[PDB]
């Protein structure tokens, strides 16, 4: 099946996937996805989880890869973020690295843990400051030279300076700084190698708030690194996400991001998009609905039918808005609080259909919108802050439609203002 960014994702038992700050690993034909368990809606350490799949889309939850230990730096009072796991051929060993911290991010350490099987459970080997310097946001890159040299990529010196450092032959420690970008203020790194060249994907530092994520290239990890460029339209702030893991997919990649929900962390969503490298400059393919053939290293973007909101039938006091950020140059504003718009003649073969809602929300806070099909009972769809009144992003909703024509009404029966609705795409 299909990869629908922003949706609620469940494992094969029907439970919400809890694997934020993703790290991916493949053994044989099996994919492993490690992440932070945030089901307690806290930034503090509950577990590093472990999900497996054969196809990157249908995940079964295994045993937790890492659990708290009272009286250590991986207690429930500490922070464990962004786990990454690589396989060490020499020792036939799985080495996990993670950002290890205290609750106020004052410790700035890395943590290491090992296992003999992919899901572990792993054995914590302790935390430390690499080469004596800060480490907060980090990742691990394992090169394809014959020594399979591995590297730590990490925000250091109070997040100001971004560093790349070689690990020793066991992957247990950092031996030597290889590259630094002073004052880059980079976070959430990942590296993909493409045609012998290295591509670093990273965010800047802005707290929980998303920002435009960048790519940099170099022909060696020592640098020099090219000047930053956007992987997505700058104003969308990486389509409201933050980089987590960049997984190679044929001659391209999959961008794996988080949409952090700081007021409800366990409902932070997963934003996965194809990251296309053919132009030589990585670009997010903004696909509301796509599928992947991970063995062939190919992706496929679902085609949908677009319906502009401004062509629907308004009701109440909803009015047209204009903006260069809008499809057709127009959107329906003053929705909710009396204002509605109904999209008529939505065609369908029947059954369940993903629908992407394209909207602008210039508030610093979320909005939401009611969505009723054919007069039926409404569901309430969350509408994150989009980055401005002229900035459109999309969130998905799954609607049951009848064979033939359908109507979809937006904004009825809510006392708050919904976001400005640009268009919808029925997939
Ligand atoms: C995602 O992974 C799921 C687990 O591997 C997988 O579930 C399995 O799905 C098949 C088909 O629904 C079931 O197979 C059969 O179920 C009973 C046996 O209990 C048979 O009598 C049936 O005739 C049928 O052959 C499995 O039971 C089911 N396993 C579990 C643990 O649920 C899903 O199919 C996968 N989903 C997708 C979209 O690929
Ligand atoms: C990787 O190399 C690290 C040295 O760079 C090494 O870590 C350091 O580890 C020791 C203990 O293992 C720490 O010492 C202890 O002392 C502090 C007070 O300073 C107390 O919190 C504790 O008593 C603690 O036991 C060092 O301070 C620490 N150095 C840094 C810069 O953080 C790691 O153990 C090595 N890890 C592996 C897998 O090799
Ligand atoms: C649907 O979107 C609504 C916004 O369009 C949202 O309403 C808002 O909810 C927040 C949090 O509940 C309120 O928050 C805070 O501010 C008030 C003072 O204004 C304080 O009393 C609180 O302590 C808190 O700090 C917002 O005031 C409120 N904003 C508006 C315009 O109504 C709904 O929460 C959303 N509904 C769902 C189910 O998510
Ligand atoms: O009050 C209900 C009404 O809200 C409108 O939303 C506006 C607010 O979100 C406002 C919050 O600051 O921002 C407006 O958008 C502007 C933008 O158009 C203008 O260029 O200045 C700044 C950019 O910095 C801001 O982003 C936004 O329009 C709805 O548009 C409207 O339908 C109605 O719901
Ligand atoms: Ca429009």
Author numbering: 22 to 448
Sentences from the paper on this structure:
In E208A_Gal3, electron density of Gal3 was observed in the ligand-binding site of PcCBM35. 2Fo − Fc omit maps showed that the binding mode of PcCBM35 with ligands is “exo-type,” corresponding to type-C CBM. The asymmetric unit of E208A_Gal3 contained four Pc1,3Gal43A molecules, and each molecule binds to the nonreducing end of Gal3 (called Gal_site 1), as in other CBM35 modules. However, the middle Gal (Gal_site 2) and the reducing end Gal (Gal_site 3) are found in two main locations, although residues involved in the interactions with the ligand in each molecule were mostly shared. The Gal_site 2 interacts hydrophobically with Gly383 and Asp384. However, ensemble refinement revealed that Gal_site 1 and Gal_site 2 do not show huge fluctuations, whereas Gal_site 3 has many conformations. At the catalytic site, Gal−1 is anchored in the appropriate position, and Gal+2 appears to fluctuate in a planar fashion as it interacts with the surrounding residues. In the CBM, it was inferred that Gal_site 1 is fixed and Gal_site 3 is adsorbed at the appropriate location at the binding site while fluctuating in three dimensions.
In this context, exo-β-1,3-galactanase (EC 3.2.1.145) specifically cleaves the nonreducing end β-1,3–linked galactosyl linkage of β-1,3-galactans to release d-galactose (Gal).
